[PDB]
Design a protein around this ligand. Structure first.
Ligand SMILES: O=c1ccn([C@@H]2O[C@H](COP(=O)(O)OP(=O)(O)O)[C@@H](O)[C@H]2O)c(=O)[nH]1
Length: 436
């Protein structure tokens, strides 16, 4: 190996998966570069369980201490775990970077980091190497954080001062932005990121410029290199589907007839809201495929599972990107996580938005009011009436025809971006010039 690149993951949520995907792409393009990937054991096992992991000659995965007591089980909240990891940082990474350098016999020449890990700037500077930051969400969420100062200083005013966020409501903003008093460790970290990010060699995103040209141009003026290289899913032969999702969708005759539902792997709405959603699915009589954990499935009305045995299918896990690409899928009821939205765009599937936390509210506002590739729910929850209305609008209405043309146009823009001469194709070659 001629080069050794250190890559530090934020070992929570869906931060580590998209960063590893980018390392896999860089590792493919740079066979003479060794990539050392630093992540928690818990996050690494999540990656192998979700099948994101693969075996490369030039990727080595290292465990970094997650700040939890060793030997005892960890029976704490996500909040506690995030606090413990941040308290253990960056010493946890420093220790393991040094052992990577001695065991490989090569000093790091470049440090790539989740943009949350603001201390990448310090770890890079100390070693005399470039710091590249990877933002795991959309440009719109990054812009909102970068304008934290201007936002706190003072609705219409905020819409008037963030280029491209004129449709955003105050309630939509990542609320870490307002955690300004006695901030939690996560809000301290994102505030320090906002201060250090402009000193990075490059900011990298799994997005494409054309989803938000005004935000993209604005953020290019804030950073040395602002590189949209996505979607990664469009720029890896699939296994076979042991869940039965694809075989079930294949038996659905009519194209764009199926409602796909997923609130991700962890969060579900209150039991009363799962009940209201189940009633809406019965009322509409659209075939549905729902990714829902077995604990949540047991809290559904007992009559619901019996009545919908021929209408729908409920599984604890779906191969989501393969589901969304199936020609029988007509709509995606989503929590509006950025990865889920981008997968939807990449397959041309319109959205019904039920956001929960973080960037999800802002993503849902962009879906309805900027991109216009889906709808939000009247009153923000999956009430029976709001859900029946949302499914009808998207699946079979004149408003649905408008949403269909908009998601097909965004789909087309995403494909052009990753094809030769595309913005993301060009930006990825720019990133290779930096890392080599
Ligand atoms: O049954 C499921 C549910 C989710 N996912 C994947 O889990 C990720 C969720 O990421 P997202 O950014 O949307 O959610 P967040 O992690 O931000 O809450 C996406 O890549 C999905 O494809 C999956 O493969 N199968």
């Amino acid at each position: 190996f001629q080069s050794h690149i250190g890559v530090l993951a934020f070992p929570f949520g869906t931060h580590a998966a998209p960063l590893l995907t980018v390392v896999q792409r860089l590792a493919t393009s740079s066979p003479h570069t060794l990539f050392s990937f630093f992540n928690s054991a818990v996050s690494n096992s999540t990656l192998f369980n979700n099948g994101v992991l693969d075996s490369y000659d030039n990727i080595r995965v290292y465990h970094v201490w997650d700040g939890t007591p060793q030997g005892q089980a960890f029976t704490g909240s996500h909040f506690e775990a995030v606090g413990l990891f941040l308290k253990a940082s960056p010493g946890n990474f420093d220790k393991v970077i040094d052992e990577a350098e001695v065991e490989t016999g090569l000093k790091i020449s470049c440090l790539i980091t989740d943009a949350f890990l603001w201390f990448g700037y310090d770890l890079a500077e100390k070693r005399g190497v470039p710091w590249l930051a990877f933002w795991t969400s959309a440009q719109c969420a990054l812009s909102a954080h970068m304008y934290t100062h201007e936002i706190l200083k003072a609705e219409e005013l905020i819409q008037s001062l963030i280029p491209g966020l004129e449709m955003a409501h105050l309630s939509d903003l990542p609320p870490e932005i307002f955690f300004d008093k006695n901030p939690n460790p996560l809000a301290i970290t994102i505030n320090k990121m906002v201060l250090k990010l402009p000193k990075s060699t490059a900011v990298i995103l799994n997005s494409f410029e054309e989803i938000d040209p005004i935000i993209t141009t604005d953020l290019k003026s804030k950073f040395h290199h602002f590189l949209n290289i996505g979607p990664s899913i469009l720029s890896p032969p699939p296994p076979d589907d042991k869940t039965g999702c694809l075989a079930w969708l294949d038996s659905q005759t009519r194209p764009k007839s199926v409602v796909y539902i997923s609130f991700g792997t962890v969060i579900t709405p209150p039991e009363n809201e799962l009940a209201a959603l189940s009633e809406a699915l019965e009322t509409c009589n659209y075939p549905f495929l729902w990714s829902l954990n077995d604990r949540a499935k047991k809290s559904l009305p007992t009559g619901f599972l019996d009545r919908t045995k021929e209408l729908g299918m409920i599984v604890p896990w779906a191969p989501q990107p393969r589901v969304l690409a199936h020609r029988s899928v007509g709509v995606f009821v989503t929590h509006c996580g950025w990865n889920s939205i981008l997968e939807s765009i990449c397959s041309g599937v319109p959205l019904i938005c039920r956001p929960f936390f973080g960037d999800q509210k802002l993503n849902s506002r962009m879906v309805e009011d900027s991109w216009k590739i889906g709808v939000r729910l009247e009153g923000g929850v999956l009430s029976k009436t709001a859900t029946v209305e949302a499914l009808g609008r998207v699946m079979m209405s004149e408003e649905g025809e408008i949403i269909r043309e908009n998601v097909n146009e965004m789909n087309e823009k995403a494909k052009i971006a990753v094809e030769p001469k595309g913005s993301s194709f060009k930006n990825f070659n720019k990133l290779l010039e930096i890392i080599n």
